[PDB]
Write a protein that binds this ligand. Structure first.
Ligand code: 08J
Length: 126
């Protein structure tokens, strides 16, 4: 029983770019979530082996985590802000899908998502 490879943090075939919205996403949006008290289960790829979740990667076929996003932003992996927002959005949704609606993790993701939404209200005009 094995974990999949984590999502790529670089691809030499994918065009790279820095935008003031991607800078804002790293310096502000990601710093804000990363430092949160509820950030810890989302700072890395979901370890199905270590966590005892043999069904996790049968259900969630597009995993994403903030460690992957942070590394993506640091390597200019994204072309635009929408790409990154999407990865964040995937992360949240993944959590919503797999967990029972009253699990603690679900409440944590909701707390991080409302924070996410607040922060991206001040995303610069590109
Ligand atoms: C992301 C994610 N989706 C599903 C899981 N997780 C998760 C990931 C990492 C860690 Cl350290 C715990 C959990 C936890 C978890 C988090 C907080 C409280 C209890 C838990 F089982 N559950 C499995």
């Amino acid at each position: 029983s094995m974990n999949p490879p984590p999502p790529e943090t670089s691809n030499p075939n994918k065009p790279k770019r820095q935008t003031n919205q991607l800078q804002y996403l790293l310096r502000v949006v990601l710093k804000t979530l990363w430092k949160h008290q509820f950030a810890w289960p989302f700072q890395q790829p979901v370890d199905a082996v270590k966590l005892n979740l043999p069904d996790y990667y049968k259900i969630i076929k597009t995993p994403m985590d903030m460690g992957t996003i942070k590394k993506r932003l640091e390597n200019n992996y994204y072309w635009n802000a929408q790409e990154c927002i999407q990865d964040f959005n995937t992360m949240f949704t993944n959590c919503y899908i797999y967990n029972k609606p009253g699990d603690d993790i679900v409440l944590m993701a909701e707390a991080l998502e409302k924070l996410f939404l607040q922060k991206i209200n001040e995303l610069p005009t590109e």
